[PDB]
């Protein structure tokens, strides 16, 4: 849970270890809780799917997740997802029960400078003597 690579040598606790499999189910449930359609502006999924028939040389091992001698993942990518999931949960928790793209793309600096709309009062001075 602390986002640290689990070590097989570590003995751990027998009782708590029973819930490790449950956490894997919880992470899958949490992943759906965060999954939702993303705006096309920052939609990285479509960038790779823009040309679905791209055929090219496979990327070198430096551009792919690290793997061990046996070929399986070393597991350090999992903690990255764990940390990434943790950050997403915190932001989502903020948005509890308690057009836009066009505006963002426009350059504000090129627009007319803001003009103050303060009021002006002129007071006449005249009154009867005491």
């Amino acid at each position: 849970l602390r986002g640290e690579k689990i070590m097989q040598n570590d003995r751990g606790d027998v009782i708590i270890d029973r819930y490790l499999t449950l956490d894997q189910e919880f992470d899958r449930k949490d992943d759906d809780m965060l999954l939702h359609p993303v705006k096309k502006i920052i939609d990285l999924d479509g960038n790779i799917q823009d040309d679905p028939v791209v055929r090219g040389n496979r990327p070198d091992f430096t551009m792919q997740p690290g793997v061990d001698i046996n070929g399986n993942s070393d597991g350090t990518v999992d903690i990255l997802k764990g940390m990434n999931r943790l950050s997403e949960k915190m932001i989502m928790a903020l948005k509890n029960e308690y057009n836009d793209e066009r505006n963002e793309l426009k350059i504000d600096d090129l627009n007319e400078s803001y003009k103050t709309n303060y009021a002006i009062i002129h007071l006449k001075r005249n009154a009867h003597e005491k």
Binding site: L94, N96, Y98, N117, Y118, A119, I121, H122
Partner: protein, 356 residues
């Protein structure tokens, strides 16, 4: 050229002061002073530390705020341990706020700041305020990050709906939320988010906030406020006060219920009627009829007199004329008087001297 260098700098400084028009200003104010006391405030950029200097300047701000706004009320909030702490109820007594700040000067700051918590508390504290008052919030932010339990955007929208105004003074750099909070809350104006550039510059920013803020044309609310003018009475024997219930030599007598009070200006505890003196309103008059700035007289023309009209100071002969004239009355003045007449006094002696 060295002497001319000072002169041209004065002209540049006077350039901003040229544009002065009688903007409508809300004399009656309700201020919620928010101070940031978090781990980020333990830095040494401000000697001895940010917390010590901010508290020290806060005391000066309290003294200045009530001096020029006698009919205003203020409240103090502080952010500590990611929570908003209330240290003084909204009141018209300057001594109460100063005493609270002095006690705060001892406790060390710790924890993280929470703008949403502070703003939410300010919104509640300003709920029981008359509609004729101007609701203002002075926030001193030093941290570059904010930890909040809820959505800050919703609170900002609520602040706009409540016609609240927020002024933020930063310490290190610009914060996205602070700019948005100061922009959306001030009708898109971007001049309400200020970042200090050195120790001295901070003093000016605090002093600037004293002056009442101009009101927006669309946000126009006109109403008549019922008030009273008690008559001071001297008593031979001490009597109980209606506010603190303690023995005092004497106090002002309310004209609506005859109940006595200790100090002015305050709302009568019995009839809830604001009690003031003629002097209290008189001070805020200069904000309603600001004195038109004096324009320097070019050396090409011929001067009227060799000495100042108001102080009889011989004008030095020395390139640039050391005389400033008033358009309304056409009377030359020395540099010293103009500063004194526009910062201490608020009436041009030349205009008054002219008969009609």
């Amino acid at each position: 050229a060295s002497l001319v260098a000072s002169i041209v700098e004065a002209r540049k400084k006077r350039t901003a002061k040229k544009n002065i028009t009688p903007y409508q200003r809300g004399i009656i104010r309700s201020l919620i002073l928010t101070l940031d006391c978090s781990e980020a405030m333990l830095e040494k950029d401000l000697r001895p530390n940010r917390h010590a200097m901010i508290i020290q300047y806060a005391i000066d701000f309290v003294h200045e705020f009530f001096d020029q706004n006698p009919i205003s009320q203020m409240g103090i909030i502080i952010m500590r341990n990611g929570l908003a702490q209330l240290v003084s109820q909204v009141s018209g007594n300057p001594q109460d706020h100063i005493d609270a700040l002095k006690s705060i000067r001892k406790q060390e700051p710790k924890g993280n700041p929470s703008l949403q918590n502070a703003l939410e508390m300010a919104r509640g504290l300003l709920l029981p305020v008359p509609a004729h008052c101007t609701r203002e919030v002075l926030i001193v932010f030093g941290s570059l990050s904010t930890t909040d339990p809820g959505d800050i955007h919703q609170t900002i929208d609520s602040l706009v709906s409540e016609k609240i105004r927020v002024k933020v003074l930063g310490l290190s750099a610009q914060v996205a939320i602070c700019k948005e909070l100061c922009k959306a809350t001030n009708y898109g104006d971007e001049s309400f988010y200020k970042i200090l550039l050195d120790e001295t510059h901070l003093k000016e920013l605090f002093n600037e906030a004293v002056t009442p803020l101009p009101v927006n044309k669309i946000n126009k609310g006109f109403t008549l406020v019922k008030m009273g003018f008690p008559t001071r009475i001297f008593e031979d024997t001490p009597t109980f006060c209606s506010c603190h219930s303690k023995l005092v030599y004497g106090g002002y007598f309310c004209p609506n219920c005859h109940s006595k009070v200790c100090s002015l200006p305050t709302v009568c505890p019995c009839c809830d009627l604001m009690l003031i003196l003629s002097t209290h309103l008189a001070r805020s008059y200069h904000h309603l009829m600001p004195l038109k700035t004096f324009a320097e007289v070019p050396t090409t023309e011929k001067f009227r007199s060799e000495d100042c009209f108001s102080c009889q100071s011989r004008f030095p002969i020395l390139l640039t004329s050391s005389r400033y004239r008033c358009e309304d009355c056409k009377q030359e003045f020395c540099v010293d008087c103009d500063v004194f007449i526009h910062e201490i006094l608020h009436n041009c002696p030349g205009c008054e001297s002219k008969p009609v």
